[PDB]
Amino acid sequence: SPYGPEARAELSSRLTTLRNTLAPATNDPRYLQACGGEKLNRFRDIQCRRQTAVRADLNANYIQVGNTRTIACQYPLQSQLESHFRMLAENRTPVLAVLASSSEIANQRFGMPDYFRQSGTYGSITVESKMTQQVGLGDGIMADMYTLTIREAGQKTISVPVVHVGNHPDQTAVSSEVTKALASLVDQTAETKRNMYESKGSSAVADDSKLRPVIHCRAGVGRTAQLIGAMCMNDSRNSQLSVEDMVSQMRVQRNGIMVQKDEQLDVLIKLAEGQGRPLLNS
Ligand code: VO4
């Protein structure tokens, strides 16, 4: 019963209502608006909740799902790279997980700069990329890892671990098993880096807005939300958090498209069922 078609239909019904309620109006006070004529939103109808926005010129949100704290964002536009790097550095980012594939990044029509696999200078910020490990996730899917060193006069230099799912499929979802492996890798990578900051006495450890994993695909609502949901199920502090709760939390804190596709919700439901976690709130 709890994972049957009726329960699943009720879950989808609740979530569809929420998506509709959260749809952005023109100049919606709930959503971040572009300053002037520079593009803010990569996709016109995928907007950034104002109250949880990380920076005034990025489409990026703080999200807390149960006890699990992250940042979800869109793939930065070329014009946003300096601001995006400053976000990454100021956050003392313990892991950046990029779920857009190499093939997507190479597709010039998508306007996704290869900002983490190449070195470059963006305004005042210079960035160096180095390749590190490669970790298989299952089904031939590979996580390629990097360290991104971000340098800027007047700022402390920050190095950010990157997990890039370079061969993420482009028109289907990855399985629950691959998602679980990816969530574990991302969480573990973050824990190692967070620990380094704690050992050094960084003030960021005490700041709820910092030390957050940063996750994006192209829009930051599909693959990204599937991963964030899996991460929250990987956190033993989140007992009794339902699938309804987690998807509602993501939507209210970013936008109504979080968990964009039914295929992605299917994975979250399967992960929840494996844990005996509820789908719905009573
Ligand atoms: O500027 V710190 O995040 O090393 O206290």
Length of the chain, in residues:
282
Burial class (CB in 10 A: 0-12, 13-18, 19+), 109: exposed
Q: For residues 46 and 189, give the distance between their C-alpha atoms in angstroms, rounded to a whole number.
A: 29
Q: Any bridge partners for residue 34, and if so which?
A: none
With the most atoms of ligand 1 within 8 angstroms of its CB, the residue from 93, 155, 156, 194 to mutate is 156
Do the beta carbons of residue 81 and residue 46 sit within 8 Å? no
Do the beta carbons of residue 79 and residue 111 sit within 8 Å? no
Q: For residues 158 and 67, give the distance between their C-alpha atoms in angstroms, rounded to a whole number.
A: 26
Q: For residues 25 and 136, give the distance between their C-alpha atoms in angstroms, rounded to a whole number.
A: 43
For ligand 1, whether the C-beta of 277 sits within 6 Å is no
Q: How far is the CA of 213 from the centre of ligand 1 (A)?
A: 17
The structure tokens 């994975």 sit at 267
Q: How far is the CA of 109 from the centre of ligand 1 (A)?
A: 39
Q: For residues 275 and 277, give the distance between their C-alpha atoms in angstroms, rounded to a whole number.
A: 5
For the question of residue 73 being annotated catalytic, the response is: no
- Smallest CA separation from ligand 1 atom 4, residue: 202
Q: Which two tokens stand for residue 161?
A: 């671990």
Q: 174: helix, coil or strand?
A: coil
Q: How far is the CA of 232 from the centre of ligand 1 (A)?
A: 27
Resolution in A for the shown PDB structure? Answer: 1.1
Write the CA distances from 196 to 97, 192, 205, integer angstroms.
19, 7, 10
Q: For residues 227 and 252, give the distance between their C-alpha atoms in angstroms, rounded to a whole number.
A: 17
In Å, how far from its chain's centre is CA 17? 23
Beta strands in the chain (DSSP E): 60-65, 68-73, 96-98, 120-122, 125-138, 141-151, 158-165, 214-216
With the most atoms of ligand 1 within 8 angstroms of its CB, the residue from 91, 194, 202, 207 to mutate is 202
Do the beta carbons of residue 166 and residue 101 sit within 8 Å? yes
96-98, strands of its sheet edge to edge: 60-65, 68-73, 214-216, 96-98, 158-165, 141-151, 125-138, 120-122
According to CATH, the superfamily of the domain at 1-282 is Protein tyrosine phosphatase superfamily (3.90.190.10)
Write down the catalytic residue from 48, 73, 217, 232: 217
CB-CB neighbours of 118 under 10 Å: 10
Nearest CA among 34, 35, 64 for reference residue 48: 34
- Smallest CA separation from ligand 1 atom 2, residue: 202
For ligand 1, whether the C-beta of 203 sits within 6 Å is yes
